[PDB]
Design a protein around this ligand. Structure first.
Ligand SMILES: Nc1ncnc2c1ncn2[C@@H]1O[C@H](COP(=O)(O)OP(=O)(O)NP(=O)(O)O)[C@@H](O)[C@H]1O
Ligand SMILES: Nc1ncnc2c1ncn2[C@@H]1O[C@H](COP(=O)(O)OP(=O)(O)NP(=O)(O)O)[C@@H](O)[C@H]1O
Ligand SMILES: Nc1ncnc2c1ncn2[C@@H]1O[C@H](COP(=O)(O)OP(=O)(O)O)[C@@H](O)[C@H]1O
Ligand SMILES: [Mg+2]
Ligand SMILES: [Mg+2]
Ligand SMILES: [Mg+2]
Lengths: 66, 466, 28, 86, 484, 467
């Protein structure tokens, strides 16, 4: 309990050189981008395919009958 | 690394690794045959030996013979470069059309959709099959089960559904043939090329085919159910798409299990089945599902051994469905096709709040007169029709019409029925029965309602006789 | 006819907040 | 006119149900066109913070494997095990 | 601190070491996986893995916990949905689990208890009149699949709104709902059903399903019990529903067979009785000196083709304090909820009703087991004396009464209302084909007019000649106003 | 000596002994428990090891845990100071009233009353329950058995039995609930304190309670009945007294035996009971008996697994009885409680030279007519009733009367029935039926015999139902 409270510090001498290193998600390589597009399709699914930045116009429909 | 076959029996083989040892589930690779012989670890026996289930014939193997770990599960092609291609249980292609060049891969095993991912979206899926629609409707993105004994018409019914459904359907469909007839595959293939759901010319194909039929080893039948599983899985998730999964026959999966459980060394359970019939199933089964992301409407044909609806296999499977259609030899033998038991097929959406209490009312009204007829069934058999009270003489006649008007000549067996293939829309389904029930037709002969479309073809028929 | 009578009785954020704000039976 | 009024309280009720539907349309559209970004930022803060906390791993596997002076801080903290326990 | 793995397969890990491990003590695995000791043998501990045993490999490391298996407890669980070990799975971040009870608790012996006197209402006319449950009772729901076995247990929790959204601290009933063996697609669709009707708030929902490991279904209904044991052992009222024990048993069988414990009937293991016996005893009616708190338990069993000889269904019936049978036959016949009166029993009888129900239906359970047999004898169209001409002339109407909608309980007061209509003979002259459009009116007519009478009977739970008198006209004031 | 646990599965613990190998049956002691754990020895696997059944759950034990050879078989608080007290499997009291205080103790594993000690005297114990007394009377100091499938009224019967027979009795009663419902023990304690056969104050308690319910292990249940009978075996052999021993449910004894049998090394036998179901029962029923020295009236209740009276458990039980009341689901289902099958129930003393020609001739006459009615039963109900003889519509008429007059509102069943209890003296039963049989009530309608006491109380309902 006295030789362990500072080994939990090897974890923000890096957490540091990361949440400050701007210039893009660090060292990514190709992988980083592709996947951030697949989950950009399916997350663009449950909702629709129209413009998400604009206010949707409105087509309306009459009441059916059984 | 490397290890050796030390025991072989049937599809169960025992490999010894001195260095290292493959996780349970690692596809191994036999080194020494002209044929990719994947093993699949399923047990660590200790003494640095593992026990594996083959994925093909094991004639030839020898005590000795080397095996290489693949470091992974059995992994197969997934993605859109599968549509139109027939692939086997390990991903290898078998339509003799080269390889399946594809970006990514998936493993056949995989944990199942967590509780948060479930979706309670219940919307009706009309089939244009009178019994199914009127009494136990299928649900979009639901699990569907077709129960039948040998020859009652599961395969025909799955086909009719594939036709009345996956022909005019913007979205991907996967068909897994698990341990059934190889000639049924050849048949599907051609039938879907002509109709053009598969296209050899393009990548306009809308269907993927996974096949491991009743000629392949237990292991293969054991697993292939999952290969085709994995495929559908992708189209749901990495595409948030509308997937149609057809399997025929999901039973052969549990059966094949049984064949191997013996030599894997488990102790036999009820009726000889594998100890692990409920979970072996349930893992596999619960992957077939509609999640928040994508959406799978599943239709599984389920064989019933010796017509025993209590046999663990069919028996357990019921738990897993949202709509069930049960086929009885009894009915089929009276030429009532499709052979649907009206009092044994059910859907978890026959509910007025979901189908509108005109539907729910004509349904349970048919379902009632039928089950009233069924009670008289005994006295009519011993004493005869005459001893039937007057009220009851009717309950029969009406019921018997309903019985007959649930028959519907499918657009497939245009060959056995000879008759022209009808497809009846929910409206005229619900209508026609309502009328029959309110006895507008007590003046028409029975036959008049046997094998027709809407209630017109009924009243219409009745004339051509007269 | 009456069953159709018993079902019915039961029933950039500032570019969206500023833009947010049958009788032939009196015959037959 | 009894058989003629179930239909006059059907139309006065079959429009009560369509005019309520169009009033929850805009909700299911509007609150959606932005509850979208509630997610296009959700996968973003997590995924990044995956590669972020994971990036930790490969820089610490580089810290011990390298730094021969991170083999001294080995025998160290560890000999402080035997002791305490007893 | 613990040792090796000898061999692994099928959720069964043999372990060479753990030499001081308690039997039934949970170990932990190399990969961080909680297991469990069950076979303490000379040269190894067979351990039932509580999850995917792919991660395990020969040689891994197994470490003791010291603890016999336990789970989260207390109000910090209500409204949630937890797996068989207490972990939350509805994606709402951990529960406030200060309270941590053991699963393996034995049941209350003889003294800690007292005769079951406390009415546990289901809001189902059928049940609350002819097979009434009471707090501390075990009443089994048994039947073929798709007969309505669940829409019983659901309609009952959904009934407990009324009491849990009020003042009277005795009439309150917190609900646990184990879900063994089912498919997530359903557990969910069901929570959604609870939530909608707004009942989810007072209701734990432990869920170990199809895909969950074997020992996890074995354990689930126990866990869900401990959680309900707290509510009783601390002076409150719990209703746990195991759905279903059939699927659980199957699971226990798997573990047992894989553990190489020689198989018995239908392959199950010897103690497959002990399994349901012990679990089901843990529901009791604690005596005042212990809290006054209760644990009513509705176990659920599923039969094949009706076969109640099946090993299991016969065991569980021998255990519970009675049962409701279901029967698809009655179902389609129109008798929804399909019950089979004559074959359903409540081994606590009226000792668990209000003296309001008792007065309208206390000898009508032995009447619809004789009007039954006395319409099955004179089925045919002949002649029968002055005594048995009437019994039939009544019953047909009476049954049209227990015919009940779904997801629409009734408060005991209203139940007494309609039951009165017939039982006292204020329907003895009406065509059955109407006895529903009738009730659906005469009960919204005497809620809009006399919240009066309901007030009394609801509270004192009885019908004084006072209350009775008012009725005696409110009724009459209706038959003559329709037909006559 | 001292021994060390070698292995543990479910309910069966093997143990190893340095020196003192305990003889089979010898109760062993588990050192280190927060509550006492005994291990009845069961076999010598050899190499100084013994397999054993636990008289409680083995949750917690550990390979090597300390076990001590208690030197001799389980021993219990046999003696007079057990009255009013709830004992258990191993003696330990559990009504919370601190040690049972006696200096006489007996092992629960005795031998059995040899041939020469057998008493041949049998005299009719009237119960006031019409059906039993008319058709199958129990005998003072004899083995009685209550057969029943689940829910048919087995347990309720035995209550109304302990209410009637055991109250107007000035001897000692020992009720032992083996393997059934804990709820039902608590339930009886308090009824038996309201009546005060158990009195918490004085020492006028006439009833020893031994208990081991469906919540306890197989070890317990397998032996709870061995205990409760050791208890009633004392009150017999000593006093020369009239001991009433009730068990509920002697079935749970063989079932319990079943559960461990597997783990004990037994190829299973038919229906999957122990290969020993037979003798296990024998060397244990053969103790619940009546010697010259004393008498024990015994009233066991037997579960019939799934109602199959041929299931090797209830089946083998029949040999060990002198009078058997068999309960019918089909009767109960008709509302005729107590659902006694007047054609499957039997007494040894239904002999005209024991009960008299009036009694006998009258019972057998009822038995006959009910049997004849059973015979017309699938003619009539499928081929027109009035197609019967004149003779037959008559033997139907009377039969259904007889058949209903056989029901009784039980005093412990008012909660269910709805009528105040009842109880008919033998000679008013004989008379009642003799009459109905004789054609004296062919005018009164059916329901008048349904659930009344003495025959006249039907002539009562005969007008009450009229006008
Ligand atoms: N829906 C149908 N309408 C008319 N005739 C049918 C129908 N279905 C089956 N038949 C007839 O009965 C046979 C069985 O069809 P099939 O769908 O193959 O049964 P099955 O469920 O597949 N049993 P099996 O394929 O052997 O495991 C046909 O080949 C027909 O001659
Ligand atoms: N009182 C009722 N009136 C009309 N329909 C009902 C009623 N109760 C239940 N149902 C319907 O009958 C079906 C079966 O109900 P359920 O509670 O799932 O029985 P079950 O035997 O538990 N089904 P399962 O879990 O597959 O065994 C449902 O989908 C309901 O909507
Ligand atoms: N004497 C009786 N009179 C009326 N009904 C009875 C009577 N005895 C039993 N019953 C009915 O039978 C049910 C079960 O009784 P029980 O004796 O506990 O069955 P078991 O035989 O398994 O112990 C009761 O709860 C009750 O409704
Ligand atoms: Mg087929
Ligand atoms: Mg259910
Ligand atoms: Mg009982």
């Amino acid at each position: 309990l006295d030789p362990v409270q500072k080994l939990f510090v090897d974890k923000i001498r890096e957490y540091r050189t990361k949440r400050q290193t701007s210039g893009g998600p660090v060292d990514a390589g190709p992988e980083y981008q592709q996947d951030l597009d697949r989950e950009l399709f399916k997350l663009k699914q449950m909702y629709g395919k129209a413009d998400m930045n604009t206010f949707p116009n409105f087509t309306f429909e009459d009441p059916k009958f059984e | 690394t490397t290890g050796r076959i030390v025991a072989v029996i049937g599809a169960v083989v025992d490999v010894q690794f001195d260095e290292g040892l493959p996780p349970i589930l690692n596809a191994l690779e036999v080194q020494g045959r002209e044929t990719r012989l994947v093993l699949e670890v399923a047990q660590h026996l200790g003494e640095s030996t593992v026990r594996t289930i083959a994925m093909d014939g094991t004639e030839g193997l020898v005590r000795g013979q080397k095996v290489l770990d693949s470091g992974a599960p059995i992994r197969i092609p997934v993605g859109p470069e599968t549509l139109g291609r027939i692939m086997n249980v390990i991903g290898e292609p078998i339509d003799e059309r080269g390889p399946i060049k594809t970006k990514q891969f998936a493993a056949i095993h995989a944990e199942a959709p967590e509780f948060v991912e479930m979706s309670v979206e219940q919307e009706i899926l009309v089939t244009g099959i009178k019994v199914v629609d009127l009494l136990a409707p299928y649900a979009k993105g639901g699990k569907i089960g077709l129960f039948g004994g040998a020859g009652v018409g599961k395969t025909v019914l799955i086909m009719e559904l594939i036709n009345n459904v996956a022909k005019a359907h913007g979205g991907y469909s996967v068909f897994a043939g698990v341990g059934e007839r190889t000639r049924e595959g050849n048949d599907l293939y051609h039938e879907m090329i002509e109709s053009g759901v598969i296209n050899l010319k393009d990548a306009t194909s809308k269907v993927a085919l996974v096949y491991g039929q009743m000629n392949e080893p237990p292991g293969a039948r054991a697993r292939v159910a999952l290969t085709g599983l994995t495929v559908a899985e992708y189209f749901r998730d990495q595409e948030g798409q509308d997937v149609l999964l057809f399997i025929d026959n999901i039973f052969r999966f549990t059966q094949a299990g049984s064949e191997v459980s013996a030599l894997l060394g488990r102790i036999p359970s009820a009726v000889g089945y594998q100890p692990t019939l409920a979970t072996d199933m349930g893992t596999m089964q619960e992957r077939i599902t509609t999640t928040k992301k994508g959406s799978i409407t599943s239709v599984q044909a389920i064989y019933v051994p010796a017509d025993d609806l209590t046999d663990p296999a069919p028996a357990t499977t019921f738990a897993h469905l949202d709509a069930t259609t049960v086929l009885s030899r009894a009915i089929a033998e009276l030429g009532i096709y499709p052979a649907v038991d009206p009092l044994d097929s059910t859907s978890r959406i026959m509910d007025p709040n979901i189908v509108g209490s005109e539907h729910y009312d004509v349904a349970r009204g048919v379902q009632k007169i039928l089950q009233d007829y069924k009670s008289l069934q005994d006295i009519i058999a011993i004493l005869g029709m005459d001893e039937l009270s007057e009220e009851d003489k009717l309950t029969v006649s009406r019921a018997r019409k309903i019985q007959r008007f649930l028959s519907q000549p499918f657009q497939v067996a245009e060959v056995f029925t000879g008759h022209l293939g009808k497809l009846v829309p929910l409206k005229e389904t619900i209508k026609g029965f309502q009328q029959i029930l309110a006895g507008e037709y007590d003046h028409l002969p029975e036959q008049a309602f046997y094998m027709v479309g809407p209630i017109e073809e009924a009243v219409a028929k009745a004339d051509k006789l007269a | 006819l009456k069953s159709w009578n018993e079902t019915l009785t039961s029933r950039l954020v500032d570019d969206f907040e500023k833009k947010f704000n049958y009788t032939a039976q009196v015959d037959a | 006119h009894y058989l003629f009024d179930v239909q006059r309280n059907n139309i006065a009720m079959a429009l009560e149900v369509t005019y309520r539907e169009r009033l929850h349309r805009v909700y299911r559209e509007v609150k959606n066109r932005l509850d979208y970004h509630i997610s296009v930022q959700n996968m973003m803060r997590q995924k990044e913070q995956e590669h972020m906390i994971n990036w930790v791993e490969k820089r610490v596997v580089q810290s011990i494997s390298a730094q021969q002076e991170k083999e001294t801080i080995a025998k160290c903290i560890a000999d402080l095990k035997l002791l305490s326990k007893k | 601190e613990t040792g090796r793995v000898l061999s692994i397969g099928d959720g069964i890990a043999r372990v060479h070491g753990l030499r001081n491990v308690q039997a039934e003590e949970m170990v932990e695995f190399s990969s961080g996986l909680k297991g469990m000791s069950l076979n303490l043998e000379p040269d190894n501990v067979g351990v039932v893995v509580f999850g995917n045993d792919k991660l395990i490999k020969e040689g891994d490391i197994v470490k003791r916990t010291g603890a016999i298996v336990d789970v989260p407890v207390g109000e910090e669980l209500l409204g949630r949905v937890v797996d068989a070990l207490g972990n939350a799975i509805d994606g709402k971040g951990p529960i406030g689990s200060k309270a941590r009870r053991r699963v393996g608790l034995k049941a209350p012996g003889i003294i800690p208890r007292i005769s079951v006197r406390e009415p546990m209402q289901t809001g189902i006319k059928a049940v609350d009149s002819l097979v009434p449950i009471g707090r501390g009772q075990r009443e089994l729901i048994i039947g073929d699949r798709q007969t309505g076995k669940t829409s019983i247990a659901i309609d009952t929790i959904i009934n407990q709104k009324r009491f849990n959204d009020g003042t009277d601290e005795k009439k309150k009933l917190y609900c646990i709902y184990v879900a063994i063996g089912q498919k997530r697609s359903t557990v969910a669709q069901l929570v959604k059903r609870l939530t909608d009707a707004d009942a989810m708030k007072y209701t734990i929902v432990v869920s170990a399903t199809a895909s969950d490991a074997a020992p996890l279904q074995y354990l689930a209904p126990y866990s869900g019990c401990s959680m309900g044991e707290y509510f009783r052992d601390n002076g409150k009222h719990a209703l746990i529903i195991y759905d279903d024990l059939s699927k659980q048993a199957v699971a226990y069988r798997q573990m047992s067979l894989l553990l190489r414990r020689p198989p018995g009937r239908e392959a199950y293991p010897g103690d497959v009785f002990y399994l349901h016996s012990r679990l089901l005893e843990r529901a009791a009616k604690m005596n005042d000196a212990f809290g006054g708190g209760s644990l009513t338990a509705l176990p659920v069993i599923e039969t094949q083709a009706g076969d109640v000889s099946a090993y299991i269904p016969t065991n569980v019936i021998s255990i519970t304090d009675g049962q409701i049978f279901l029967e698809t036959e009655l179902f389609y016949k129109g008798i929804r909820p399909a019950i089979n009166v004559g074959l359903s029993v409540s081994r606590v009888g009226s000792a668990a009703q209000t003296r309001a129900m008792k007065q309208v239906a206390g000898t009508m359970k032995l009447e619809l087991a004789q009007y039954r047999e006395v319409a099955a004898f004179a089925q045919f169209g002949s002649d029968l004396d002055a005594a048995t001409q009437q019994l039939l002339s009544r019953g047909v109407r009476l049954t049209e009464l227990l015919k009940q909608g779904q997801y629409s309980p009734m408060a005991i007061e209203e139940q007494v209302a309609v039951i009165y209509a017939g039982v006292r003979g204020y329907l003895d002259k009406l065509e059955p084909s109407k006895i529903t459009k009738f009730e659906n009116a005469f009960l919204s007519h005497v809620i809009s007019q006399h919240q009066a009478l309901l007030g009394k009977i609801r509270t004192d739970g009885k019908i004084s000649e006072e209350s009775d008198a008012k009725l005696k006209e409110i009724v009459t004031n209706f038959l003559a106003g329709f037909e006559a």
